[PDB]
Amino acid sequence: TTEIHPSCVTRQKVIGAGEFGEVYKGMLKTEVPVAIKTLKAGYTEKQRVDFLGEAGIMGQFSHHNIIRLEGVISKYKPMMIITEYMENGALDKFLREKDGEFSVLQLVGMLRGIAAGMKYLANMNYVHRDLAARNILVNSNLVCKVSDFPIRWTAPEAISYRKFTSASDVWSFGIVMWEVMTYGERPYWELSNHEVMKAINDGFRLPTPMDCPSAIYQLMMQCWQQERARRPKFADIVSILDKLIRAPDSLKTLADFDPRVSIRLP
Numbered sequence: 714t715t716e717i718h719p720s721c722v723t724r725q726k727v728i729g730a731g732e733f734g735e736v737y738k739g740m741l742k743t744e745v746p747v748a749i750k751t752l753k754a755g756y757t758e759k760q761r762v763d764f765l766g767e768a769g770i771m772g773q774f775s776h777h778n779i780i781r782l783e784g785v786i787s788k789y790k791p792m793m794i795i796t797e798y799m800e801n802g803a804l805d806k807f808l809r810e811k812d813g814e815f816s817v818l819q820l821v822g823m824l825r826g827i828a829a830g831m832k833y834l835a836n837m838n839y840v841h842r843d844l845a846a847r848n849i850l851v852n853s854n855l856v857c858k859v860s861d862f863p864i865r866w867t868a869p870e871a872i873s874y875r876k877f878t879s880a881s882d883v884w885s886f887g888i889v890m891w892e893v894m895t896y897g898e899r900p901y902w903e904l905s906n907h908e909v910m911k912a913i914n915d916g917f918r919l920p921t922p923m924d925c926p927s928a929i930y931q932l933m934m935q936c937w938q939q940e941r942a943r944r945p946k947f948a949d950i951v952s953i954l955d956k957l958i959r960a961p962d963s964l965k966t967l968a969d970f971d972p973r974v975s976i977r978l979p
């Protein structure tokens with residue numbers, strides 16, 4: 714793993730909180746803006762294992778749609794994980810702040826990216842477990858990168874008996890699809906966590922977003938199959954989203970939106 718000397722790192726502002734440290738924005742000389750996760754004095758043995766273990770696996774990943782590791786500071790204290798900085802931040806907040814500002818093709822393109830990075834993770838035998846728009850970062854080319862800094866996002870088997878697999882990630886990716894196409898709406902709106910699980914078990918599923926291609930709704934619906942073996946694999950998801958994008962007239966057929974309010978005018 715690329716070891717970085719602390720003299721090359723300039724922390725500037727705090728932007729979040731880690732396991733046992735803060736997360737900063739800063740500069741890296743070799744000047745490149747970076748995000749910095751620190752492990753502060755007093756960390757436990759387990760925290761160090763997880764911290765440097767996160768660094769190790771990130772260093773193994775090399776994919777367009779996975780956040781890139783710039784390097785690590787492990788020979789000096791505080792220890793640091795240093796990644797590329799993504800100017801547009803977390804996808805959930807991004808979309809909520811840019812409601813209606815993109816084309817359907819752009820939105821589906823985001824989803825293709827996320828799916829490509831998840832296919833890569835799943836093939837590397839990495840189970841994310843917390844896939845959600847809030848863990849996806851967006852750069853100045855609209856490229857979405859899976860990161861890892863959730864009842865409503867979690868497959869039934871992962872909730873019920875903690876079976877977390879790439880197939881439970883697929884369920885979550887279904888929910889991310891809906892997040893994207895709704896521009897960051899809260900999945901299941903104000904339903905409580907227990908009402909969500911009850912709804913799912915009862916067989917209900919999130920309704921179609923407004924202005925949503927029929928193909929895209931069909932795909933998220935198949936990510937939400939109760940039977941884990943029936944869900945698409947990420948290879949299936951990437952393949953469909955790539956074909957839809959490359960034949961973009963396919964996205965013009967829209968699923969019917971179920972109106973929650975009727976407005977009558979002559």
Ligand SMILES: Cc1cccc(NC(=O)c2ccc(C)c(Nc3nc(-c4cccnc4)nc4c3cnn4C)c2)c1
Nearest residue numbers: 729730736748749750780794796798799802860861862
């Ligand atoms: C695939 C995988 C597997 C396993 C683990 C991971 N780990 C990371 O993805 C990770 C690890 C370290 C860092 C420095 C980053 N960077 C960022 N984290 C945050 C942030 C974090 C926490 C609270 N608020 C914001 N914000 C950022 C970046 C970059 N730009 N921005 C705006 C990400 C990834």
